[PDB]
Amino acid sequence: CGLVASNLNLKPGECLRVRGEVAPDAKSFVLNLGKDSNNLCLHFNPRFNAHGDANTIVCNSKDGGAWGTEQREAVFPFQPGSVAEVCITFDQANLTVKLPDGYEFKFPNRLNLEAINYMAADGDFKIKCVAFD
Amino acid sequence: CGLVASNLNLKPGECLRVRGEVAPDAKSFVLNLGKDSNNLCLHFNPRFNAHGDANTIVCNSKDGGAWGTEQREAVFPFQPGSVAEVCITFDQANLTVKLPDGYEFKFPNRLNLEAINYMAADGDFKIKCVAFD
Numbered sequence: 001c002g003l004v005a006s007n008l009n010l011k012p013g014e015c016l017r018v019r020g021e022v023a024p025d026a027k028s029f030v031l032n033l034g035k036d037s038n039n040l041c042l043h044f045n046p047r048f049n050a051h052g053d054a055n056t057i058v059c060n061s062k063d064g065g066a067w068g069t070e071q072r073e074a075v076f077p078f079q080p081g082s083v084a085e086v087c088i089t090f091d092q093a094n095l096t097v098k099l100p101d102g103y104e105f106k107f108p109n110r111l112n113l114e115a116i117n118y119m120a121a122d123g124d125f126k127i128k129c130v131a132f133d
Numbered sequence: 134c135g136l137v138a139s140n141l142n143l144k145p146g147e148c149l150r151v152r153g154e155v156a157p158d159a160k161s162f163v164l165n166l167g168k169d170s171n172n173l174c175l176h177f178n179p180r181f182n183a184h185g186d187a188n189t190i191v192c193n194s195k196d197g198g199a200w201g202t203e204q205r206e207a208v209f210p211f212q213p214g215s216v217a218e219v220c221i222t223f224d225q226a227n228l229t230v231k232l233p234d235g236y237e238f239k240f241p242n243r244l245n246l247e248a249i250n251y252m253a254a255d256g257d258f259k260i261k262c263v264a265f266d
């Protein structure tokens with residue numbers, strides 16, 4: 001369990017940027033965003049080799065403790081042993097996740113949060129910088 | 134309040150850099166660092182006009198919920214309505230706080246902390262970036 005931040009007050013349209021080091025032997029890492037640990041509008045989980053999955057981004061939500069319907073992306077712009085930046089914004093309909101190598105995708109916003117107040121990082125990613133719009 | 138962060142895992146000699154916006158109407162702002170909210174190795178409180186002080190930085194510690202004795206610094210390189218960066222490092226004996234315009238001071242490490250895991254901001258300072266060197 002890595003950095004946890006609360007009271008972020010990230011409003012629609014504003015950008016959260018996180019830069020970190022992906023471990024040389026990384027298996028996976030997680031960024032969680034939402035209201036608190038039980039209420040995540042985005043669970044962002046690049047899996048290098050975890051849960052039987054290789055080089056796959058897994059995303060989901062968590063609402064009142066309940067995991068939503070998982071979705072997988074088809075591009076994996078991360079390497080073990082490198083620096084990576086992630087940029088996230090949102091509006092009421094979607095979160096937009098921008099990643100290295102030009103890749104961007106949307107994830108439906110399934111919760112009803114006015115602002116994103118909570119971020120937690122976990123796994124094989126050493127956070128070097130966080131910037132809030 | 135403002136941003137609260139935990140699991141910072143800051144170790145001796147490492148640098149925590151915090152950049153933010155000092156509000157236009159600033160009276161006072163606070164950056165708290167320590168083990169947790171009741172165990173602060175540094176309560177860093179620039180006062181523009183507050184609690185009986187004008188353009189003075191007040192520092193204190195908090196040990197098991199109990200405030201220590203305040204120390205008043207001799208410099209004040211802050212202005213309302215501006216951006217500011219504060220850089221903090223610590224060791225066995227002291228915290229070193231680097232401020233805008235080349236100023237710095239030391240504050241004794243009264244709790245003898247070997248790691249800083251908690252930070253919180255309050256008042257007229259909106260955190261825009263946090264970085265780890």
Ligand SMILES: C=CCO[C@@H]1O[C@H](CO)[C@@H](O[C@@H]2O[C@H](CO)[C@H](O)[C@H](OCc3cn(-c4n[nH]c(N)n4)nn3)[C@H]2O)[C@H](O)[C@H]1NC(C)=O
Nearest residue numbers: 028029030043045051058059060067068069070122123124
């Ligand atoms: C839909 C179920 C089908 O089988 C599997 O069931 C697993 C759960 O029983 C699925 O894994 C979870 O997927 C969740 C997202 O939908 C979360 O990723 C969950 O892990 C939560 C977690 C991660 N971490 C963590 N700590 N550090 C790191 N790097 N990750 N701690 N807690 C994973 O345990 C796993 O994704 C899923 N597989 C598929 C293909 O969907």
Ligand SMILES: C=CCO[C@@H]1O[C@H](CO)[C@@H](O[C@@H]2O[C@H](CO)[C@H](O)[C@H](OCc3cn(-c4n[nH]c(N)n4)nn3)[C@H]2O)[C@H](O)[C@H]1NC(C)=O
Nearest residue numbers: 160161162163176178184185191193200203254255256257
């Ligand atoms: C008639 C004078 C009585 O003496 C005063 O007594 C006050 C209350 O104990 C002293 O203030 C506290 O000093 C503490 C450090 O020793 C803390 O600064 C305390 O405020 C807690 C606090 C402030 N903030 C905050 N957030 N944002 C801002 N701007 N401030 N968050 N938590 C302040 O309420 C204040 O420093 C002290 N001043 C004198 C000169 O002794």
